[PDB]
Amino acid sequence: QVQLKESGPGLVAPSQSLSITCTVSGFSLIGYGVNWVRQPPEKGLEWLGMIWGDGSTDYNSALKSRLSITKDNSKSQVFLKMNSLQTDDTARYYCAMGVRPDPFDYWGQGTLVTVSAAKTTPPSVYPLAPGSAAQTNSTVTLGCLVKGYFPEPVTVTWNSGSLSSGVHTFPAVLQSDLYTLSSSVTVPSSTWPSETVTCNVAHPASSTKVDKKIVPRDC
């Protein structure tokens, strides 16, 4: 039952430093090494470094000593520190470990790190309700528009997660240093507007949590 979870800042300005904490569970850091791997927006995997049980470290030579890894065995925490970040350091940063000496068996969810001087901006959440009436025994498509936020990511759910099937959340598009995305949900006409349908949008970087009830509109 090994688990790793990364906690990072989400946004780092160019030439500034990156700090991420990997909190592990299910094993002692005394006995196992922890590795760091990042995935840039265009995908692929790049190993960054590791810290052994005894506290020694190995790093990727390409990082030019900008990378330093430490840990606190007693708190099950591994500390990633990288200096003078540039745009091409934008990536999802994973911490990973293997119960054998290798290969890596357990990966965290990773934390997205965007390198930009742009400012953090909260999203605007708008309901997308149909313009006309729904036919009998039809399935109706609703949506939410999430506009003008930065940086990634946002999370969207429907009815606090109780509405999981029939959902499409589209990838965000970047324009003028602002992200926009949308999410659709398709449900039977006998369930809406009879029952509540609400989209739940979270932008952790802005500490924003918004619920937008989808209500019918005046045809």
């Binding site: 030579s61 990966w107 149909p130 598009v173």
Partner: protein, 217 residues
């Protein structure tokens, strides 16, 4: 520092068919003091972290389906899926852990399936956005295949191309279809300058375009 190259970069296949992928290393990954090939295969589905499929080049990780088999030695390795499942949609990375840790560029596995017509939905701007001075008109084109699709925005009959932003989802893990969102962003004043707003979609599944419209009325 060993370099790992994979081929093909991407690959499409129907469900139930067999596929083979290739991973080549610039230096041998066979350790003489172990007679083990330090070679691993990972699967990464959209929105998920890598998942170890194979290690020692041919040892299958516990819990992995038996359709996944890896083979090869020295500098030439192969991953086979005896019968591709719809859920096998993913990027497959090979990996060496003999001398430091390096990864291949990945092979993207995509799923071929039967054509599927889209469901088109058009949504007028919300009152919340209009109060802010903006007027985004949104069109959802859901659960179609193949990915190629043409969307045309018409205002009072005339076409508009400025302010259109399109976004496609990944292939669905269960039915392997595509969805697309098209957002036409105007200001409130521009929006209130016209009346008829139309999202017109054209897809291989039909010669007649799908027309969804609303009137600001």
């Amino acid at each position: 520092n060993i370099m790992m190259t994979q081929s093909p970069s991407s690959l499409a296949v129907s469900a139930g068919e067999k596929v083979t992928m290739s991973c080549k290393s610039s230096q041998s990954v066979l350790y003489s003091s172990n007679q083990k090939n330090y070679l691993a295969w990972y699967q990464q589905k959209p929105g998920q972290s890598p998942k170890l499929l194979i290690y020692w080049a041919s040892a299958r990780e516990s819990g992995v389906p038996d359709r996944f088999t890896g083979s090869g030695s020295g500098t030439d390795f192969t991953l086979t899926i005896n019968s591709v499942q719809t859920e096998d949609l993913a990027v497959y990375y090979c990996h060496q852990y003999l001398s430091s840790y390096t990864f291949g560029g990945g092979t993207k596995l995509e799923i071929k399936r039967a054509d599927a017509a889209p469901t088109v939905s058009i949504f007028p701007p919300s009152s919340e956005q209009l109060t802010s001075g903006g007027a985004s008109v949104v069109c959802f084109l859901n659960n179609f295949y193949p990915k190629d699709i043409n969307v045309k925005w018409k205002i009072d009959g005339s076409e508009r191309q400025n302010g259109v932003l399109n976004s496609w989802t990944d292939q669905d893990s269960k039915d392997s279809t595509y969805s697309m969102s098209s957002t036409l962003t105007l200001t409130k004043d521009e929006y209130e300058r016209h009346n008829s707003y139309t999202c017109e979609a054209t897809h291989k599944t039909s010669t007649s375009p799908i027309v969804k419209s609303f009137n600001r009325n």
